Amino acid sequence: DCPPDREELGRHSWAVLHTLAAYYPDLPTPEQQQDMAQFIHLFSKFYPCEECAEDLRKRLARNHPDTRTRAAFTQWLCHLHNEVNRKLGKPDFDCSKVDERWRDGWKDGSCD
Amino acid sequence: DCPPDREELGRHSWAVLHTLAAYYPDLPTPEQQQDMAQFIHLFSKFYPCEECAEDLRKRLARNHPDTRTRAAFTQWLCHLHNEVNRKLGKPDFDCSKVDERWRDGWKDGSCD
Ligand SMILES: Cc1cc2nc3c(=O)[nH]c(=O)nc-3n(C[C@H](O)[C@H](O)[C@H](O)COP(=O)(O)OP(=O)(O)OC[C@H]3O[C@@H](n4cnc5c(N)ncnc54)[C@H](O)[C@@H]3O)c2cc1C
Ligand SMILES: Cc1cc2nc3c(=O)[nH]c(=O)nc-3n(C[C@H](O)[C@H](O)[C@H](O)COP(=O)(O)OP(=O)(O)OC[C@H]3O[C@@H](n4cnc5c(N)ncnc54)[C@H](O)[C@@H]3O)c2cc1C
Ligand code: NA
Numbered sequence: 001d002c003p004p005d006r007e008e009l010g011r012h013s014w015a016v017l018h019t020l021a022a023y024y025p026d027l028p029t030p031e032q033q034q035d036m037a038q039f040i041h042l043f044s045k046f047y048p049c050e051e052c053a054e055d056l057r058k059r060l061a062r063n064h065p066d067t068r069t070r071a072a073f074t075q076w077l078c079h080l081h082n083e084v085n086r087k088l089g090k091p092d093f094d095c096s097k098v099d100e101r102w103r104d105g106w107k108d109g110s111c112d
Numbered sequence: 113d114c115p116p117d118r119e120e121l122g123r124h125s126w127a128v129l130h131t132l133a134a135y136y137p138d139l140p141t142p143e144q145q146q147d148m149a150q151f152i153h154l155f156s157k158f159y160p161c162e163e164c165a166e167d168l169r170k171r172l173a174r175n176h177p178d179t180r181t182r183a184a185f186t187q188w189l190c191h192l193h194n195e196v197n198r199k200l201g202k203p204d205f206d207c208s209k210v211d212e213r214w215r216d217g218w219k220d221g222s223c224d
């Protein structure tokens with residue numbers, strides 16, 4: 001029960017972000033589309049890893065969140081995460097698997 | 113690497129929320145105060161535990177986030193969490209300890 005470090009906070013943050021994405025509507029209202037884009041922007045203002053937050057705001061200044069549908073947003077966010085992975089020398093996550101990882105469980109049923 | 117369940121997602125969500133609070137400014141601008149209140153409201157719209165999110169929106173409809181300073185917000189959020197703890201038959205967290213838990217580490221140095 002110590003304050004989470006960069007690694008622990010980062011993992012939990014992605015878990016939160018990818019989970020919210022995984023359950024976002026397939027057919028969001030215009031308000032939901034605006035709200036979710038604003039949510040990601042606000043996260044970028046307050047994420048307390050200052051280097052991380054700066055990096056993120058830079059990225060979002062060009063690459064605005066795609067919140068048009070669940071499919072779009074889950075893909076958008078998976079790609080954003082892979083950009084961070086690449087910076088940190090981590091492998092790309094296969095974005096075609098984003099639903100298995102964050103909603104449905106692996107196809108082999110190992111999460112059932 | 114399975115989709116987090118209610119318990120795992122909840123723990124990580126509180127970790128994220130209390131950490132953002134712990135590092136929020138002592139002297140936030142009016143824009144930061146509005147932004148952080150909006151951030152909490154948006155979280156309440158998208159948190160995918162539907163019972164949880166409903167519960168939260170109900171609470172926030174009366175008890176709006178206090179984002180006036182770091183001290184206020186960390187306390188506000190600790191109290192909000194304790195309301196949820198109480199519903200779930202968990203003990204109250206001592207809010208006077210919120211900085212030890214989420215920023216500084218325990219006074220005994222066990223986190224150093
Ligand atoms: C917006 C943001 C920005 C950050 N910027 C920085 C930074 O600039 N510098 C820095 O050092 N750290 C940064 N971090 C923290 C960093 O990205 C990691 O969270 C941290 O290094 C821990 O890495 P990890 O290997 O445990 O797994 P993480 O990258 O935390 O991934 C957690 C899990 O998510 C899954 N996953 C991995 N990639 C993807 C993907 N593309 N899509 C969907 N799921 C995936 C995997 O199952 C993985 O185990 C940032 C975090 C966030 C949320
Ligand atoms: C906004 C929100 C709402 C939720 N609503 C529900 C709900 O209606 N029903 C439901 O079943 N679950 C709900 N959850 C999930 C639930 O609150 C817990 O996260 C989950 O049951 C796991 O509990 P836990 O005992 O692991 O610790 P959590 O309550 O997840 O706490 C994690 C850690 O935070 C620290 N902590 C505990 N209390 C406080 C506090 N008051 N202030 C600061 N730090 C604290 C402790 O170190 C604790 O180990 C909600 C979560 C959130 C974020
Ligand atoms: Na660590």
Ligand code: NA
Nearest residue numbers: 117118119120
């Ligand atoms: Na569990």
Ligand SMILES: [Zn+2]
Nearest residue numbers: 006007010088
């Ligand atoms: Zn690292």
Ligand SMILES: [Zn+2]
Nearest residue numbers: 004008012127
């Ligand atoms: Zn943790």
Ligand SMILES: [Zn+2]
Nearest residue numbers: 066067068072
């Ligand atoms: Zn699109």
Ligand SMILES: [Zn+2]
Nearest residue numbers: 079080082083
């Ligand atoms: Zn790219």
Ligand SMILES: [Zn+2]
Nearest residue numbers: 118119122200
């Ligand atoms: Zn529970």
Ligand SMILES: [Zn+2]
Nearest residue numbers: 015116120124
């Ligand atoms: Zn986890």
Ligand SMILES: [Zn+2]
Nearest residue numbers: 178179180184
């Ligand atoms: Zn106040």
Ligand SMILES: [Zn+2]
Nearest residue numbers: 191192194195
């Ligand atoms: Zn109360």
